[PDB]
Amino acid sequence: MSAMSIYIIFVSIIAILFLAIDLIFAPHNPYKEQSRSPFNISFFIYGLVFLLLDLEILLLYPFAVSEYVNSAYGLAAALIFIGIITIGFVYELGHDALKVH
Amino acid sequence: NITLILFLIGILGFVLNRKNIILMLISIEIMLLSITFLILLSSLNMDDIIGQTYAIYIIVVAGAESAIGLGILVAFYRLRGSIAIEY
Amino acid sequence: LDKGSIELFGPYGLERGLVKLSKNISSLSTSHVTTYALYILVGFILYLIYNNLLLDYSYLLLIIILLLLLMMIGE
Amino acid sequence: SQISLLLLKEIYTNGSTHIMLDILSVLAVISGICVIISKNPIVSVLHLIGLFAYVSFYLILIGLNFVGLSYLIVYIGAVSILFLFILMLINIRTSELQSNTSNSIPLTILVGIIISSFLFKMLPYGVIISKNDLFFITSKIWDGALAENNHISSIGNIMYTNYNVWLILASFILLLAMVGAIVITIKPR
Amino acid sequence: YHPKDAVHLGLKGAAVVGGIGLLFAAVRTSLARKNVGPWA
Numbered sequence: 078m079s080a081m082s083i084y085i086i087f088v089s090i091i092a093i094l095f096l097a098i099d100l101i102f103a104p105h106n107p108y109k110e111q112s113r114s115p116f117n118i119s120f121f122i123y124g125l126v127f128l129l130l131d132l133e134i135l136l137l138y139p140f141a142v143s144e145y146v147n148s149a150y151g152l153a154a155a156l157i158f159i160g161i162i163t164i165g166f167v168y169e170l171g172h173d174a175l176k177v178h
Numbered sequence: 179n180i181t182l183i184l185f186l187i188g189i190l191g192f193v194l195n196r197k198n199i200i201l202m203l204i205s206i207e208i209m210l211l212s213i214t215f216l217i218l219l220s221s222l223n224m225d226d227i228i229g230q231t232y233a234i235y236i237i238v239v240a241g242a243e244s245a246i247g248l249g250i251l252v253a254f255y256r257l258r259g260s261i262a263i264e265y
Numbered sequence: 266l267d268k269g270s271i272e273l274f275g276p277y278g279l280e281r282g283l284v285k286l287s288k289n290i291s292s293l294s295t296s297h298v299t300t301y302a303l304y305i306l307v308g309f310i311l312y313l314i315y316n317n318l319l320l321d322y323s324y325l326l327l328i329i330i331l332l333l334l335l336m337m338i339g340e
Numbered sequence: 341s342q343i344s345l346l347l348l349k350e351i352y353t354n355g356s357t358h359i360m361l362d363i364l365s366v367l368a369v370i371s372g373i374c375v376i377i378s379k380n381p382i383v384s385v386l387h388l389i390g391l392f393a394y395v396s397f398y399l400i401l402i403g404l405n406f407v408g409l410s411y412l413i414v415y416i417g418a419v420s421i422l423f424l425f426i427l428m429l430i431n432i433r434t435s436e437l438q439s440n441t442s443n444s445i446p447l448t449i450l451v452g453i454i455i456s457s458f459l460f461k462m463l464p465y466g467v468i469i470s471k472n473d474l475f476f477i478t479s480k481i482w483d484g485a486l487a488e489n490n491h492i493s494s495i496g497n498i499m500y501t502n503y504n505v506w507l508i509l510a511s512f513i514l515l516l517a518m519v520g521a522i523v524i525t526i527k528p529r
Numbered sequence: 530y531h532p533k534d535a536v537h538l539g540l541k542g543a544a545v546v547g548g549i550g551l552l553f554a555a556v557r558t559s560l561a562r563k564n565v566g567p568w569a
């Protein structure tokens with residue numbers, strides 16, 4: 078079989094064995110024994126800006142593994158793509174959208 | 179055949195939904211995944227890298243609508259206090 | 266005739282008939298996104314059936330006249 | 341004299357099994373219903389995280405490594421995390437999100453039959469290609485193998501030059517999702 | 530001209546139009562505001 082497959086199974090098996098020791102040996106007991114408040118908008122912004130910048134950085138990864146062919150024409154277009162995304166970053170820096178300062 | 183099944187699932191998410199407006203966000207994304215997966219499988223069948231590029235741009239627009247949508251849902255919640263439809 | 270059937274089978278009967286119809290259709294609009302989404306799917310399927318089953322166009326007009334007269338009846 | 345066509349099992353270049361695809365598709369379907377039936381929006385999003393990974397694995401298992409990894413990095417890494425944030429913070433009463441699904445069960449048979457019976461015919465032969473059975477034959481080439489590129493390198497070769505207008509329009513879509521989402525949510529200053 | 534089997538065509542008309550109305554009845558069941566169930 079492939080090494081990747083046998084590796085995932087082995088990691089899976091080790092996890093089962095460590096779990097089994099807890100179930101087999103560790104002590105067990107049958108006895109296993111409402112408000113509202115606004116949440117900070119900051120939590121939304123952290124995932125929002127991450128999601129957008131993560132996509133933009135992702136779109137740049139193909140350029141890095143194709144630079145010999147993209148060359149000067151590709152560099153130019155990738156710089157125009159960098160500049161547009163940077164201007165959006167300066168906007169979140171300008172409005173302290175992250176509400177960190 | 180898997181791509182059509184998942185497109186039904188997203189569609190049936192709208193068929194079976196009277197109260198969840200969150201589940202309509204989820205069902206839109208299942209429909210986008212089915213359409214991107216169809217383009218991706220037909221791309222491998224025709225040796226065309228342009229299908230992979232179109233799939234990538236559908237993933238970017240899909241995330242951008244998720245951001246625009248969950249932001250509007252946050253604006254709505256701030257004043258309403260519930261995301262529930264009084265049915 | 267003049268103050269009777271000419272106004273009943275005419276402006277006054279079209280007035281009271283249409284106002285009743287328009288209130289019923291206007292009562293389909295409940296501003297629920299869940300119910301509006303169902304309508305779009307319904308109107309989607311009817312377009313798919315019509316332009317794939319090669320149905321006689323007259324079959325459509327019967328549907329519209331049926332639908333319109335169903336909103337003409339209250340309750 | 342003996343059969344000219346001979347069938348043998350490959351030994352060290354034997355690829356993967358078609359079965360894994362029937363397993364992943366069945367898993368993708370099963371979690372798909374669980375999304376649209378679960379009472380808790382949290383559990384639905386978790387079943388969505390499960391679905392996105394089944395499709396990602398199917399793509400990586402058929403050779404689409406960069407897009408499958410991209411799906412894993414974007415959908416599970418970022419899109420669903422934003423979904424957990426909003427869901428784990430909004431006050432959700434689960435009884436107010438439950439509807440009588442049985443009332444909607446007849447329309448589910450109707451819509452499923454009609455939509456499937458139309459869309460299926462529309463697909464191309466190669467999506468529905470899968471008792472004598474066809475087998476897909478492949479051979480080797482030399483001139484077209486001189487400098488083979490990974491798919492990301494091939495996407496990169498054309499993404500920033502020939503089809504650069506798509507990058508420009510997407511950069512402005514992301515730019516709009518940045519400015520617009522902040523303007524509708526944050527209190528200025 | 531070629532005679533048409535009126536009874537045979539009549540069933541086709543009833544099923545085609547009655548099928549669409551059955552789809553309309555289904556929307557009514559889905560949109561019903563009480564636990565009427567599937568057999569409604």
Ligand SMILES: CCCCCCCCCCCCO[C@@H]1O[C@H](CO)[C@@H](O[C@H]2O[C@H](CO)[C@@H](O)[C@H](O)[C@H]2O)[C@H](O)[C@H]1O
Nearest residue numbers: 093094096097098099100101102103104105106107108
């Ligand atoms: C994840 C892979 C699949 C699982 C593989 C391992 C499975 C192990 C199953 C057997 C586990 C036995 O573990 C044992 O369970 C019993 C029953 O709950 C516990 O017993 C405990 O609860 C019972 C409840 O009636 C009490 O009467 C008893 O006095 C108390 O000690 C033991 O304290 C625990 O040590």
Ligand SMILES: CCCCCCCCCCCCO[C@@H]1O[C@H](CO)[C@@H](O[C@H]2O[C@H](CO)[C@@H](O)[C@H](O)[C@H]2O)[C@H](O)[C@H]1O
Nearest residue numbers: 163166167168169170171172173174176177178528529
């Ligand atoms: C390639 C990398 C390029 C990097 C470019 C860097 C961006 C430069 C332009 C943006 C910075 C200037 O924009 C400036 O941002 C700062 C920091 O939020 C703001 O700072 C001010 O407002 C915010 C919000 O009330 C307060 O939290 C902060 O304490 C206050 O000093 C200024 O009001 C704004 O004018």
Ligand SMILES: CCCCCCCCCCCCO[C@@H]1O[C@H](CO)[C@@H](O[C@H]2O[C@H](CO)[C@@H](O)[C@H](O)[C@H]2O)[C@H](O)[C@H]1O
Nearest residue numbers: 271272273274275276277278279280281282283285337
């Ligand atoms: C010389 C005659 C020239 C006529 C030219 C064309 C005039 C317009 C033709 C249609 C007129 C509308 O005709 C009218 O439609 C509405 C339909 O809701 C009906 O109006 C009424 O229906 C029933 C009575 O039967 C009532 O209980 C109901 O309250 C009311 O809506 C009348 O039954 C009909 O008379």
